[model samples]
Target: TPDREKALELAVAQIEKSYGKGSVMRLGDEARQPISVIPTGSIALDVALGIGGLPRGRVIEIYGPESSGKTTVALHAVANAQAAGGVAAFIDAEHALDPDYAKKLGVDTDSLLVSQPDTGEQALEIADMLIRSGALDIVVIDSVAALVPRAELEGEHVGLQARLMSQALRKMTGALNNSGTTAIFINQLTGGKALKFYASVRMDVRRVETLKDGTNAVGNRTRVKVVKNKCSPPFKQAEFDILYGKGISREGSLIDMGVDQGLIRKSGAWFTYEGEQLGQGKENARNFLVENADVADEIEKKIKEKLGI
Candidate 1:
């Protein structure tokens, strides 16, 4: 836990040191990082990452629980990036990549040269090679744990290696960034409880059961904390409906967006400002958006879904 906390601190430090100061040295003439913004699927979520969006041309590590939509976000991002004329590469260190699934998410399997690196070193090597090849627009090293299994994590050499890998990814992003390349490192959280989750912009994906009234919480069940992203300003979060094949949405339709207007259709052919079903006198739809609550809620949901834990 101590080590994990320390590691987290280091990660945060990297953000503040670079993005915090605006790092003019890194920003030349363009007034921002040259690599441009990384689309987070949802524009609302991208704004939370930074001024414009998550910094491209850098290896951002996302660690979290399985099926927490982490992979969904990654796949969506790849599709978005490609849509923006950015070709992204995904290296499967876990070897569990489902190309068919990726296809459903709209990733180009042909353009994406997915690699199966049995060793973390091999994955990194492939990543480094890709970075050096100057061909990819984006590259992702999937799931950090694929790097090793209970190896020398505490050793100085291991620390050095981790830093080196991170730096290598950073430099590659910097170098190939001009060519419109961005990189990501899909990582996993170690330890059981993950007590060291940071709070700033932190995204910890928890599987919670939503009550009928719309309260989200973890019931008496097992869950994994997938992904923690804390960037100091405190994270903005919202709940979304994890649609079967459509990715995510604000958990409600246009009807839900019209709730706060006090214009709910009542039990009549015409509409009513009050809550009521139809002429049959039913309980009516649960549509409700109190005070422009829909916009804020929608934005928040978009932000969280794109920048999920």
Candidate 2:
């Protein structure tokens, strides 16, 4: 693991160079820290995007319309980051953060610092504070579209919306890259103009269709497009489901994808191959693979070959 340790040190060095000796930078936490990419926890989505996960030390924007699962995806990243022993901060500029929901999404509420910044300026200021502090591994700004410039709030018609965002990003771009922090800027897609921040990765989320059962909204199938990715191929698309009370659904998708790849035989109501019954029904087959050791291994092997993961 020498190479891994060296990689960790390089990541640490990136943060250290951000603040020099006798600089005005805040110095409280250890100068050196280890950071790694955060995974989305879905194999198909992760492989489709081509990036192992969201890379640290970069800016990422996840945007879409109402209920498009933007926040869910961000929270999932935060959850995975925290699961890897990282701290997080959430700046609720839109005043729309629900602690209960965040906890349900597996966010470490006890360790997460939630702040409500009044203006976009204030939000950037707070972001500067946290990113420079070197204690947080991830910082999330709820929605850039909701952030109003101070002048605009004061009835001034001044407009440089994109430029203003780009300016705020300019201030933290270096630190964000050097500090090994992953910043998620949740944005809403409006008219002609959109986010102008320096995002290393740009993801577009959209609702493909509603999964309903008996007139009840059971879940939502969504598509995430990697419009821009420095770590992987751009414009790659992936699909997943956000079910009620159940986060992102993967088993059915996994099985269906395997079927499409000809790795798993699918019948009308059952799945089988090589005289071995994988399971009955997509749900049952998924469960069978998940619970069976040899079967699971074969499925994953085939998946890696099919997707080149």
The clash count for each model shown is 19, 0
lDDT of each: 0.49, 0.74
Deviation (Å) of 64 in candidate 2:
0.8
Provide the TM-score for each candidate, comma-separated: 0.56, 0.78
- lDDT score, candidate 2: 0.74
Candidate 2 residues 1-309, lDDT tens each?
978989876666766467432122222322221234687745566665564578788888888998898888888888889999999999887877666777776788888988888787888889988999888889999878777788878776456556567677887888887889989999887311434336767889999999876699988888898887656556777887777665665565567667767787877687876568877776678667657767666776678666535
Model 1 lDDT per residue over 195-246, tens place: 1321112344444554232354321111222233332122434333333445
Off by over 4 Å in 2: 1-35, 190-197, 260-263, 272-278, 286-309
**Candidate 1 C-alpha RMSD relative to the actual structure:** 11.0
Worst 10 residues of 1 by lDDT: 191-200
lDDT of 1 at 111: 79
